[PDB]
Design an enzyme around this catalytic site. Structure first.
Site, mmCIF file in Angstrom:
data_model
loop_
_atom_site.group_PDB
_atom_site.id
_atom_site.type_symbol
_atom_site.label_atom_id
_atom_site.label_comp_id
_atom_site.label_asym_id
_atom_site.label_seq_id
_atom_site.Cartn_x
_atom_site.Cartn_y
_atom_site.Cartn_z
ATOM 1 N N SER A 40 0.788 -1.146 -0.127
ATOM 2 C CA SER A 40 -0.075 0.158 0.166
ATOM 3 C C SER A 40 0.914 1.444 0.009
ATOM 4 C CB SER A 40 -0.899 0.000 1.214
ATOM 5 O OG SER A 40 -2.102 -0.927 0.937
ATOM 6 N N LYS A 43 0.333 4.299 -2.493
ATOM 7 C CA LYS A 43 -0.947 5.228 -2.086
ATOM 8 C C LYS A 43 -0.581 6.569 -1.712
ATOM 9 C CE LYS A 43 -3.970 1.549 -1.136
ATOM 10 N NZ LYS A 43 -4.286 0.544 -0.105
ATOM 11 N N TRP A 75 -11.248 -3.768 2.525
ATOM 12 C CA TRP A 75 -10.520 -2.612 3.470
ATOM 13 C C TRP A 75 -10.429 -1.168 2.741
ATOM 14 C CZ3 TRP A 75 -10.670 -6.641 6.363
ATOM 15 C CH2 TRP A 75 -10.010 -8.008 6.006
ATOM 16 N N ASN A 102 -8.661 0.863 -0.125
ATOM 17 C CA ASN A 102 -8.090 0.282 -1.361
ATOM 18 C C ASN A 102 -9.125 0.663 -2.527
ATOM 19 O OD1 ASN A 102 -6.219 -1.460 -0.677
ATOM 20 N ND2 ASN A 102 -7.407 -2.809 0.397
ATOM 21 N N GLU A 138 -4.624 -7.026 -6.251
ATOM 22 C CA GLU A 138 -3.413 -7.898 -6.904
ATOM 23 C C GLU A 138 -2.145 -7.492 -6.779
ATOM 24 O OE1 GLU A 138 -6.221 -6.896 -8.440
ATOM 25 O OE2 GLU A 138 -7.429 -8.426 -9.374
ATOM 26 N N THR A 205 2.302 3.738 5.288
ATOM 27 C CA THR A 205 2.768 2.302 5.430
ATOM 28 C C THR A 205 2.186 1.608 4.226
ATOM 29 O OG1 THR A 205 0.589 1.968 6.469
ATOM 30 C CG2 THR A 205 2.502 2.497 7.866
#
Length: 261
Positions: A40, A43, A75, A102, A138, A205
């Site tokens: 992640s 992002k 999420w 997400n 994915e 994170t």
């Protein structure tokens, strides 16, 4: 390097660290040019790419994105809650950065031309290492040796510095990126665990689909001296796994801050 090697041996996987002190130019570097899964952590750069577009397209940030249930994925705590009314580009960006949402990330990726669009943005600021290839969820696969959806700690730190403290974004956009990072809620056990309380931190994170593959990057503002930019990435040793990824990240961040002059 020995403290990092000992930490890494205790962890059992691989750790990569790059820290730069923007006052003196001093650095700390361990496996800093190796590739690690972004998870992640892409992002944050996604939100920066949105802000770059806001230099050129008036009203982009307050533009509503109406999405349906088909856009939701696990999420997505913010985008699921506002599914009825939709969310603006800025609201999706805040959700992607601060809650790792997400669905918000996928909606913004679509707006920017997909993984290839985000990669092109990173190339435009001088990052030749970053690559995003896939969408959520994915991109979390974290297959060992797979270069898809990876970067290096050094490239992450250098790009983060350009976007938060340097010249890659205009000042209002830079401040908005800083504010989103400062308000992140998902990093309270990672780099933020390594800093004195009276400093300030902005971070993003990443946590992949394999236990032991996780990361955090941050700008750290001490009191009375220039900020530090740093990235800590891990790869799992290579169901009910117990790899203490967050504690390793915090411990590596401590060593970086202690090792700088």
């Amino acid at each position: 390097a020995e403290p990092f090697a000992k930490l890494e041996q205790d962890f059992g996987g691989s750790i990569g660290v790059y820290a730069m002190d923007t006052g003196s130019g001093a650095t700390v570097s361990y496996r800093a040019e190796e590739r690690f899964p972004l998870c992640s952590s892409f992002k944050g750069f996604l939100a920066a790419a949105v802000l770059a577009r806001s230099q050129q397209q008036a009203g982009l940030l307050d533009t509503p994105i109406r999405y349906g249930k088909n856009a939701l994925v696990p999420w997505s705590p913010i985008s699921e809650k506002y599914l009825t009314t939709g969310m603006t580009v800025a609201e999706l960006s805040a959700a992607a950065v601060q809650y790792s949402d997400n669905a918000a990330a996928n909606l913004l990726l679509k707006e920017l031309g997909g993984p290839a669009g985000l990669t092109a943005f990173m190339r435009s600021i001088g990052d030749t290492t970053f690559r995003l290839d896939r969408w959520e969820l994915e991109l979390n696969s974290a297959i060992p040796g797979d270069a898809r959806d990876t970067s290096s700690p050094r490239a992450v730190t250098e790009s983060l510095q350009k976007l938060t403290l340097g010249s890659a974004l205009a000042a209002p956009q830079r401040q908005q990126f800083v504010d989103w990072l400062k308000g992140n809620t998902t990093g309270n056990h990672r780099i933020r665990a390594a800093v004195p309380a009276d400093w300030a931190v902005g971070d993003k994170t990443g946590t992949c689909g394999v236990y032991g593959t996780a990361n955090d990057y941050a700008v750290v503002w001490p009191t009375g001296r220039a900020p530090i930019v740093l990235a800590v990435y891990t790869r799992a040793p290579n169901n009910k796994d117990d790899k203490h990824s967050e504690a390793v990240i915090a411990a590596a961040a401590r060593l970086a801050l202690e090792g700088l002059g």
